[PDB]
Design a protein around this ligand. Sequence first.
Ligand code: SAM
Ligand code: SAM
Ligand code: ZN
Ligand code: ZN
Ligand code: ZN
Ligand code: ZN
Ligand code: ZN
Ligand code: ZN
Lengths: 222, 222, 97, 95, 86, 82, 110, 109, 100, 103
Amino acid sequence: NSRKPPPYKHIKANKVIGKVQIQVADLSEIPRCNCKPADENPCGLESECLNRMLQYECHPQVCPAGDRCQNQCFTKRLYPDAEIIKTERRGWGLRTKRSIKKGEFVNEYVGELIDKEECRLRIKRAHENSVTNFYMLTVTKDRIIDAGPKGNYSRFMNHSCNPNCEAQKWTVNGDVRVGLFALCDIPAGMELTFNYNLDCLGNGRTECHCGADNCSGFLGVR
Amino acid sequence: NSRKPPPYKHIKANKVIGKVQIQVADLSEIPRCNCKPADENPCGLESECLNRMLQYECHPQVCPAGDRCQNQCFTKRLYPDAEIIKTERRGWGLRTKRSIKKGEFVNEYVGELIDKEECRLRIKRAHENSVTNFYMLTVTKDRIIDAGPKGNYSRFMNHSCNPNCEAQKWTVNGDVRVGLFALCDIPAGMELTFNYNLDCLGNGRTECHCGADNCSGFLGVR
Amino acid sequence: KRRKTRKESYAIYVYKVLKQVHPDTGISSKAMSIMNSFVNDVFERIAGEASRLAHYNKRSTITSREIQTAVRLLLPGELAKHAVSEGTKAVTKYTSA
Amino acid sequence: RKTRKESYAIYVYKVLKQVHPDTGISSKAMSIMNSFVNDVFERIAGEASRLAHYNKRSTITSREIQTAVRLLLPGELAKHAVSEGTKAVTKYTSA
Amino acid sequence: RHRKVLRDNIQGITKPAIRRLARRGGVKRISGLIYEETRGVLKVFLENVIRDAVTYTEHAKRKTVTAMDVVYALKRQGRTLYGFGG
Amino acid sequence: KVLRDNIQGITKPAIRRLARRGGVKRISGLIYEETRGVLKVFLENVIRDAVTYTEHAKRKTVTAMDVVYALKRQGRTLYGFG
Amino acid sequence: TRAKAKTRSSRAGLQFPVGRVHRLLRKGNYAERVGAGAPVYLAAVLEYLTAEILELAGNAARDNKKTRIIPRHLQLAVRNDEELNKLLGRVTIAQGGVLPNIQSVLLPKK
Amino acid sequence: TRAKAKTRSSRAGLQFPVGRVHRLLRKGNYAERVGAGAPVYLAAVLEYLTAEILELAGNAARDNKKTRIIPRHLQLAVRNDEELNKLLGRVTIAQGGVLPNIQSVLLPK
Amino acid sequence: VLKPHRYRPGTVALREIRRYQKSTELLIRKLPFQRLVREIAQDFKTDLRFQSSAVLALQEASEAYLVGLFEDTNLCGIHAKRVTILPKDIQLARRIRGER
Amino acid sequence: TGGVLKPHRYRPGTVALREIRRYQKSTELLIRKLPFQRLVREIAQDFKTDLRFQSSAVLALQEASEAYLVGLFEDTNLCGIHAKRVTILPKDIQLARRIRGER
DNA sequence: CCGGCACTGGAACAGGATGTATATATCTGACACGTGCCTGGAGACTAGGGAGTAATCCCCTTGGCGGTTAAAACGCGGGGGACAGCGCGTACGTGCGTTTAAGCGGTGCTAGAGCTGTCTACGACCAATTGAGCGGCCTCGGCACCGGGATTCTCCAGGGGATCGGGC
DNA sequence: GCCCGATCCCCTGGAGAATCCCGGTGCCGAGGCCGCTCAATTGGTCGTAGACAGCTCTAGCACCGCTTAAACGCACGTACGCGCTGTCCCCCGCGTTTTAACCGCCAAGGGGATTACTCCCTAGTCTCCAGGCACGTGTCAGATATATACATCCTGTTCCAGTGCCGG
Ligand SMILES: C[S@@+](CC[C@H](N)C(=O)[O-])C[C@H]1O[C@@H](n2cnc3c(N)ncnc32)[C@H](O)[C@@H]1O
Ligand SMILES: C[S@@+](CC[C@H](N)C(=O)[O-])C[C@H]1O[C@@H](n2cnc3c(N)ncnc32)[C@H](O)[C@@H]1O
Ligand SMILES: [Zn+2]
Ligand SMILES: [Zn+2]
Ligand SMILES: [Zn+2]
Ligand SMILES: [Zn+2]
Ligand SMILES: [Zn+2]
Ligand SMILES: [Zn+2]
């Protein structure tokens, strides 16, 4: 009631439950940039990387910079600070230790690969017995990421009409994945939060109880 | 000292005193327009005559529109009204009777084809016997017009720093002439005037003593 | 003096053609060179096209049937329809005598 | 029936095995090399023809062939081909 | 007679087809009036080649258009093409 | 004597006259240096071919037919000079 | 020779030389043999394409009050006809000049 | 025929047919007489020109980790060399493609 | 169910510029292209048959023509300080080339 | 002691529209013959040394050079007008030559 | 307070959930190799003409000098055009769901392309005769300038005729 | 009261004008003739290219059914044209002074262009013999595709070790 939530099975990768699986592509359909072996930032963040700009991810077997490039971040998992902490206005929230300049990302959104009909059935069960499951994410047609039973330190996140993160999708090794980022520079020790545009098939539940210029709003107004 | 100005000889064309006379042009150098035999104004005023805009003058043997054209005005002498009236501020000047739409011209400025050295001789004569000649106008290097002995109503004219007449040069039948045109629209019954910029190697005589905003100026500055 | 050798041109047939369209005009010695060049330039395009038409088909003769096709491939739309009439009338009048 | 058809396939395949001993080639590419050879042959011959005509001659010789290459090939290609030709023409006669 | 005539077949060159041809040439943003003009530009180019190919075909006294007539009619306008014979 | 600096005999008014016959009304100030480089690479391509045609015939004098052939070779036919 | 000779230009009714076109075809390296109607067909086209130009050149020389053709009229004749201008597109005539043409946006307006 | 027949392209030291180039020249209506060193001169040039468009196509195919040659490697070899690009300027190669090129004003800032 | 932020304008275009410049296939439909050839060719002669590979030869010439006209059209727009192409750049390109 | 009057000048664009009409109607040559003839002999010296020229072979080069330049200055103008200008700059010549196919 | 006895868990066990390599099912299509033969290339002469080499002639390319006038060079003012910054609103791009032809395998059929054999009319070849076309020397004669009187018109010239301050 | 002697608006004897027009005069570039020589027409003879009739067999056109990727509407938010205003600098129109292109002569010699003579390089025939082309046998390109014990990592559990509580 006042401490660490009930146990949640931790998973690092994305497992499959339904019928669609991962797409292991060979080293023949992966795009390849045009950077040159150079100073501290090759294929870096302040560079002109044709693969970074278009939201691609380089493979260490094609990128000419070998193992010096910085464009391999989804497969290495050097997540920053701000593990789980407790919030008083909402459930848990998070707070960081070091200030992150604009341009770095936060832990990847992991879960289970349920499908459309399975989401239908699950939300209908949880509705008819009043559980109100709200851990879903549509990434493609008949492909949904579920962070209800499993997940990581990401699924303990909230909404904010004045946010500082963003949910933008990347294509890695011929497969689409979702990752949280940082909008701009922020201080340390505060609660990072992100906006999401809800799409409800029924009724709208509540109003966003954040405090700022325009955070009166609602949950699903725009 | 109370009536019409001292006697002058009334003439219409210009005669030669020096060595070079008119350059009689053949009917093979006269430029040509693109007007068609059409409504009431061919080669008119509000139309776009490729001759009228470049300050040329048609000749009835080449122009396609024949004799209906209205671009024959230096050779027909349909001079306007406004005979002589004595002036209270300066000697005689001139005055008009009716109104004139801006875009039409007044009598041609005619005289004698004096030259450089003889003009020098004449100005020195006027100094060493107190005449102070004031009838000179440059048209071309060693081609000058003098309106002392010859002339018409035009030579009875004065200066202003805010006039309503302008002196532009036209090329008729291969020969460069000078005709005064009206700057702005003029109501009936006032004094017209044109501005001239002097070029003298002597000393500055006086200031333009009219009454207006920029009327002060001076003779030989602006 | 040596009486230098002879050189042939078309300048006495161009002059016969001119006097049937305009019986009272002349022509300049520098305007006749341009017409020589014109005729010599148009002869070669047609001959060179018929030479390839006859070789694509494995023949070894040039007849009045390759010339007609070369005229159509070379000339524009409304020009290529009067030249055919001229040529096909001349050939008929010739082969009757 | 099916008399024959001549091509440069068995000579292109001989030349390839001197620059790249372990490499193949396909049919769509052989059919392009053939067109290339046939296209250059008839640009080089149809100009020696015109040279011999302009000069009032009747024979095509190695001098016409050498001059008609300096007008076609640009730059260093000509400088190397003119050297390649006069080696074969020298080795052929002294035998 | 099996004489099924055709009409209004210039609308089978759709809008996505034209967008792909413009993407291969390097174009980022496209107006909305290019589509009714690329078709007029293509219909002019095809006629000047089909006319010459049919002219080369009638001379040989045949009824089938072969793949050499097209190569000759193309090379005759300075647009040589490698790969289809010759 | 070896010649040099003759590209500057193509003056500025001589280029304004060609621009007026072409039909232009107003001219910048860097066109005069841009045009003397376009005129100097057109002449080399023609003189090279004329001198080749001249050496093939064992002469020492460039005639007026060498230039006509070297022009026709590049699709720039010229009527009037035999 | 037994009868009275008659040139071949008079049998067809032409003004250009059939017997010289025949020899130019025969000694020009075009083919191994040459038929009998090829010169008679080629001369009758070479003459039409010449009358066609001289007519327009004479018309153009008349509208300037002159009685003689010079290289300027051959230029004005061809650059005004949309099929001669297609036949002679890449050709340069010596001492011909250009056509008068000014763009509308450059004219001085009020 | 007494001695041992020996080809004409083995005296010169070539790979292309001199005896066939000769007949193609003689039966093509180019002139009235053909000398004796003209085919020997022309075969060497036809061989030099073809023995160097393959030495670039092989290199371009080895940079894709492949074994054969296909019509795309010939395009890549030809449009990347500044003399062959001027010789084969108005030629179209079937199934070739284009060169990867994107302007500098259209990239995002 | 929530959705992630959508792409920005100019990415899904700049990403397929990069993949159509890498393949070598044909970019039109074969049956619609062939029905138009058989229709144009009716104004010159009736009852014509076409070999199977005389129609595969015209498609490549046509696509090679259009792909290269668009690259000339794309420079006039940049000259005028735009990034879209309009129907008045095609006309300038063709007129300067010498076709219309 | 006495001034001499002067009329009004011309407006910018009149003496430049008179010369277009004067030069688009003549047929004369617009370059000086001796300056042009020195340039040809200077260029042709880096191909073969000490060779002579015919007086009518030097006159055929001058007729082609002018016909080339006059027809390049007509394509430059259409680009200048495309970009909404009246002045021609050095970056129109390059666009014209690149689209036309030389550079 | 010591021992009995019930109460309880970090960590590994048994059987299982599940991730990576390995032994068959069976197709699989196109470049690189043998073998016979039939036509085209090589060898050995002979015959006639095309190109090479040496003299001779005269045309036309190069070089120098003097005088005159038109074009090129240089410095000023000034007004008009190129260029940057804002602001508004229309039209092109991205995403989602329903509707429509393109592509891929068969099956049946005949129109016309490609090759073989026979045979008549057409173009190359050669000798003899004659007129169409090219070069050189001459007229004739309608074009640009000088006169040149003298022409329909206007003009410098002072003159006559209606009109007054006193004159009579 | 009538009019004297001078007085300024009409008026024309030569003049002067440019030049409407009516004749000489010196002009180069198109037109015109009279030899003359070589290229086109007339008349047979000969042999191969091409026209025409048959016949075999590939390949272009038409029809039918099934699965699924591509084309078609429709809604919404925002990035990009397009017009308007203000500043400043650079190109155009004018006068003076300086330089070299043009035009007309004269002079010397290099090299282009014929003409005669001779020799060797190429076409044309017969023999003869091996290279290149069509068809047939062979070894992978090693892809792609399923089953299958069990390779280390996540976990329900059952006797075992600490542990606290009840009791004698
Ligand atoms: C996604 S869960 C995050 C933490 C999780 N519920 C927990 O307790 O561990 C947050 C739930 O509270 C609601 N919620 C979170 N932040 C909110 C806010 N700022 N305004 C209104 N509702 C909010 C959302 O509807 C969501 O269902
Ligand atoms: C051009 S003449 C013609 C007028 C006549 N000569 C007269 O003034 O009695 C005028 C002379 O008067 C002078 N003038 C006229 N108006 C003037 C004015 N408004 N201010 C100064 N001087 C003026 C001029 O200097 C000139 O010399
Ligand atoms: Zn990288
Ligand atoms: Zn990179
Ligand atoms: Zn809120
Ligand atoms: Zn007009
Ligand atoms: Zn008029
Ligand atoms: Zn004043």
